[PDB]
Design a protein around this ligand. Structure first.
Ligand SMILES: CC(=O)N[C@@H]1[C@@H](O)[C@H](O[C@@H]2O[C@H](CO)[C@@H](O[C@@H]3O[C@H](CO)[C@@H](O)[C@H](O)[C@H]3NC(C)=O)[C@H](O)[C@H]2NC(C)=O)[C@@H](CO)O[C@H]1O
Length: 129
C-alpha cells in the first residue's frame, strides 16, 4: 500500500506515535517519506547482508527475522514480512521499541539527514487530526 500523506499521519496518530518519546507526529511522517516514499512494500538490501523492510525501513540485523541474516537479533520478535503489510500496526509497534533503545530517531538515517532540525510540522499541514 502506498499511503497518502494525511492518511499516514492519521494512522500513526491512531497508533500512538504523536509525541511518542517526545517526537512529534511530523517527525514520523517525514521519516516514512524519505525512508520508503510511504510504500509499505519497500525493501532495500545493505552491504552487511541485512535488509530494511517496510514503511519505516526496519533492519533485519537487529529487529526482525528474515531467515537470511546470519547471527542477527530479532528484537521485535516478528518475521520481517509482517512489516510489509498494508496494516502498519507491526511496524509502529516495532518502531516504538527502536526509538526507545538509546539513539532516539537517529536510528533512521533518512530522519537524521533530512528531517532532524527542519520544520517537521509542515508534514502534517492541512490534515484533519
Ligand atoms: C530503523 C532501523 O532498523 N535502524 C537501524 C539501526 O537500529 C542500526 O543501529 C544500531 O542499532 C542498535 C540497536 O538499537 C544500536 O545498539 C544500541 O546502542 C545503544 C548505544 O548507542 C545501546 O544503549 C543499546 O544497548 C544498543 N542496543 C542493543 C540491542 O544492543 C546500535 O548502537 C546501532 N548502531 C549504529 C552504528 O548506530 C543501524 C546499524 O546497524 O542500522 C539501521 O538500519
Amino acid at each position: 500500500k502506498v499511503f497518502g500523506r494525511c492518511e499516514l499521519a492519521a494512522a500513526m496518530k491512531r497508533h500512538g506515535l504523536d509525541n511518542y518519546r517526545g517526537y512529534s507526529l511530523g517527525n514520523w511522517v517525514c521519516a516514512a517519506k524519505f525512508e520508503s516514499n510511504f510504500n509499505t512494500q519497500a525493501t532495500n538490501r545493505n552491504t552487511d547482508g541485512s535488509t530494511d523492510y517496510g514503511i519505516l525501513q526496519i533492519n533485519s540485523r537487529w529487529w526482525c527475522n528474515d531467515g537470511r541474516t546470519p547471527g542477527s537479533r530479532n528484537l521485535c520478535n516478528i518475521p520481517c514480512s509482517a512489516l510489509l503489510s498494508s496494516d502498519i500496526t507491526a511496524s509502529v509497534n516495532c518502531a516504538k521499541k527502536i526509538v526507545s533503545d538509546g539513539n532516539g530517531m537517529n536510528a533512521w538515517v533518512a530522519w537524521r539527514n533530512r528531517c532532524k532540525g527542519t520544520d517537521v510540522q509542515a508534514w502534517i499541514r492541512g490534515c484533519r487530526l
